[PDB]
């Protein structure tokens, strides 16, 4: 019942899990170790992945989990930010509940402050991204997304992602109707051993499987014919019935000798057309590997059927459900097929040079630690996901991050509090206080004192200027310090900012996340 503080118990249960997400965002934050049910330690910065592995029967927590999926799917950033904003709205609302304020004015107060905040976001944009897609220009948007994970490696990993995005985007001008970037077209590989400086950017899909045959790689001639066969290699049979059975020993000689002549006849018809590569998605027999060595055909196997759909858009080959029909219309062309040593093992690399432009790219990564390669691999997928948000719907607009905008918006929210009469004055003032948790967590995770960073941010953004036009610098953020002497510095010097499409979309998600929790005054479940 409400006399026992049921609305407080729902907040207290989330407040105990609120401190977990407070240490997620930021490079100086902390990570949580979660043991998977398969007996493997999995750790990552992104909260949307950890919430899926954690089993929580609390429906109030699931409200923030479902709101987190909106930041993970529709956007490439803001998964850790929505958990901090929605979690703080429940704590600041305890002051209004203790005073006897109904949940109507609390929800109505956030709705009125939501339209006031979203309207001011258009004036917070100073510069606009021209979408040049240049290698140096893409480093501005990609760096803050790759940041707050594996601090210190953001300088080298910035050139790997920025180069892969330019390869996926085709060359076009004055056309915004047709989409270009694809999320699933970029696959990242990891191999133990090596160093970070040995990484590079290659156009294609790197195959780590063994060549399985005496032919390691093809020649240097352009447009290698590649055939993708879905049906496994076996003796030619009849589509109707055609079941092989054992009855008399006389048929045993025809079974062994029959498979040698039929398989050799099918490989001869394919080699006559000039096909130098055969891709078999299923298992390959032993007798098939002996004939491909004399014909000079590269052996390649792809056990994963998910990569066969994306392979058709790269080389141009088509899968054939039958076997023995080398249709020329289903054959692809690739310029370069070689074999290089990646991570200490010999692997066959699949790439190209100029012709047959493909949208599939692969970022090769190396490292000694296996757990560190998991976060870097997932950071690239979250880094390239922000490219989708660079399109016409406010993709060029930007706002200063790292605590610069959250402190500056406080002065604008408090100004509208006394301007709007009625009971909404209490909800507007508490709406700006809930934004003070973002700069506070950045100072705690960085080792800085709470009494230091907070008063310095207010004095930096609040000055007396005899004039209407604002002066000095409004870009002052939360500095990590740990260097130089004292004070903060301009965040624009490091080219770190929060994209407006990430911040504006996160406000609507954060308000609706805390609205559902505050609107539910009673819960009923069963023992499980």
């Amino acid at each position: 019942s409400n006399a026992d503080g049921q609305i407080i118990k729902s907040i207290a249960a989330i407040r105990e899990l609120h401190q977990m997400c407070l240490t997620s965002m930021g490079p100086c934050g902390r990570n949580k170790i979660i043991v998977n049910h398969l007996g493997k330690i999995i750790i990552t910065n992104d909260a949307a992945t950890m919430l899926r592995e954690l089993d929580i029967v609390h429906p109030a927590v699931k409200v923030l989990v479902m709101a987190t999926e909106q930041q993970k799917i529709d956007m490439g950033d803001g998964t850790n930010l929505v958990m901090i904003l929605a979690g703080e709205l429940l704590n600041v609302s305890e002051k209004l509940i203790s005073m006897g304020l109904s949940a109507v004015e609390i929800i109505q107060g956030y709705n009125m402050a939501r339209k006031f905040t979203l309207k001011e976001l258009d004036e917070m944009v100073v510069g606009e991204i021209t979408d040049k897609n240049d290698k140096n220009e893409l480093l501005k948007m990609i760096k803050p997304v790759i940041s707050s994970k594996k601090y210190g490696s953001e300088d080298i990993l910035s050139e790997l992602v920025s180069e892969a995005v330019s390869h996926v985007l085709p060359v076009a001008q004055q056309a915004g109707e047709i989409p270009y970037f694809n999320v699933d077209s970029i696959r990242v590989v990891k191999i133990m051993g090596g160093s970070l400086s040995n990484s590079t950017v290659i156009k294609g899909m790197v195959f780590n499987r063994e060549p399985e045959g005496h032919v390691k790689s093809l020649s240097e001639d352009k447009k290698h014919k590649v055939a993708v066969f879905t049906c496994p290699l076996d003796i030619a049979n009849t589509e109707t019935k055609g079941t092989v059975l054992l009855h008399n020993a006389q048929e045993m000689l025809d079974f062994s000798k029959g498979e040698e002549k039929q398989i050799d006849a099918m490989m001869k018809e394919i080699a006559d057309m000039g096909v130098e590569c055969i891709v078999a998605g299923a298992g390959v027999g032993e007798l098939a590997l002996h004939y491909l060595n004399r014909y000079g055909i590269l052996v390649l196997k792809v056990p994963s059927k998910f990569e066969l759909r994306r392979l058709c858009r790269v080389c141009g080959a088509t899968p054939l459900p039958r076997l023995g029909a080398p249709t020329p219309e289903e054959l692809g062309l690739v310029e370069t097929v070689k074999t290089m040593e990646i991570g200490g093992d010999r692997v066959t690399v699949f790439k190209q040079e100029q012709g047959e432009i493909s949208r599939t790219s692969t970022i090769i990564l190396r490292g000694a630690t296996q757990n560190n390669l998991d976060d870097i691999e997932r950071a690239i997928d979250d880094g390239v996901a922000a490219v989708k948000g660079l399109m016409k719907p406010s993709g060029g607009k930007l706002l200063p991050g790292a605590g610069a905008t959250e402190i500056e918006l406080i002065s604008r929210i408090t100004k509208y509090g006394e301007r709007t009469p009625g009971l909404l004055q209490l909800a507007i003032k508490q709406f700006a206080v809930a934004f003070e948790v973002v700069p506070r967590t950045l100072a705690e995770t960085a080792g800085l004192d709470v009494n230091e960073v907070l008063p310095n941010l207010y004095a930096a953004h609040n000055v007396t200027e005899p004039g209407a036009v604002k002066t000095d610098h409004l870009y002052k953020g939360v500095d990590i310090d740990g260097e130089s002497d004292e004070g903060v510095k301009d965040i624009r010097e490091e080219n770190i900012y929060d994209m407006l499409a990430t911040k504006k979309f996160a406000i609507n998600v954060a308000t609706e996340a805390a609205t559902t929790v505050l609107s539910i005054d009673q819960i009923i479940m069963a023992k499980k």
Partner: protein, 506 residues
Amino acid sequence: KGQIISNINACVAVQEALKPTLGPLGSDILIVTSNQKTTISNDGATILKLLDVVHPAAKTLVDISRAQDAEVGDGTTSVTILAGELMKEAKPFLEEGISSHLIMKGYRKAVSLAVEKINELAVDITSEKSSGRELLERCARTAMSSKLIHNNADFFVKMCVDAVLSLDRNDLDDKLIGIKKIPGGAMEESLFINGVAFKKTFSYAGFEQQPKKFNNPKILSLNVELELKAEKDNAEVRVEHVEDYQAIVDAEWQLIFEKLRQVEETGANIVLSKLPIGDLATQFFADRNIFCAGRVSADDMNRVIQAVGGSIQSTTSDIKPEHLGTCALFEEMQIGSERYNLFQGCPQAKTCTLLLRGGAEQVIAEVERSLHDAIMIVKRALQNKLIVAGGGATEMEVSKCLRDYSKTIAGKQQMIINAFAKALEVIPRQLCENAGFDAIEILNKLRLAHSKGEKWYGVVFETENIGDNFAKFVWEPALVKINALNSATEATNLILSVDETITNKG
């Protein structure tokens, strides 16, 4: 902060097991695997691999040891002790209010300054005041000192240096040199073998033949079983005729005679396989001077392919004539009431074998592992020309320089770097305690001459005293000291960065 403190004791518990195993004179730990097999070793790698600790931070110290054993292979024990020592130094800092984030930040600046000092202490020297043969011989006597073999170490160094020189200096591996234990006999009578040798577990008949003197025997690999015996399957054949009872026992001898005839036409004088060879063939091979040995391990058969360049064929039909190989000379010794088979004079052999003799099997096991520590010093001498002074020399100076550089640094990083410099004192400590010397007296006496400006002063492992390891011939490569500070810091940064431990059962 409660789970962080729990992770501190988890690292000390794992570190405590590796403390007595640090150093050549250190104690050995006994671990009983679930397989009920007794395993005793002082190498931290194998020790941590057999524990299989469910604790996430304790497993991190195990995973980082595998990376130290892969890229390098030396220092797997010291990298965990150094990594876990930072957990104890950072324990009182958490209660005082100092966050572990600034503590992890001070380590990145301390190691960056420590690696620069390692290259300054590494001096490349090859032909200066040293010869070609005496260079690797003086390095083997370092690991053999203060051991039961010190009296016989004069004869053991000659066999150790010849094992490395018998292989290409560009590619060297400790797994390429085979060692077989010979029970019984004198220790000083051991000899070195250029080829490959196995245990010869075949106990069956057919002795007194196949003498130890061969001219040019032909080696051929074997896959299937040459004997006609069928161990598993069978059949039921019965006739009702009286006179046919004789002829129904007489048949099967002809079956494999067809395939066995092709073996005689090849002329292979050596028969080896991963399966036990039947006793049927042990006679006629003596007439043709063909040698055969059964019950050979699978690991010893891989060295035969790399020796004479042989190949494994399934049947006796398609065997090619060029797959055969021959050695210069054969030798077989009956010492120890057991015959031992070994090959000699193989110019194409990529491996060798060193036989060891002693009074007991447990005595030789301590001699074999004491040699492995000397092999790594001889192997890394020719591979890497940059070496640093070990045995307390380098370890004490890295902690000294950080004390002076911390004076110019202001803020919490001063006491953090000083804590990292103090954490470096655990390495020389355990080396003295495991060797019997008092770690308290040496710690005070070593810091005396350490402040006189000379950075090469080490700790004598034979007689307790302070001095320079340059006369003790204690050499260590620079790649181990550099990668130890990076692997210990990276493993420590992952444990201190996790406040909450979550484990889901499935």
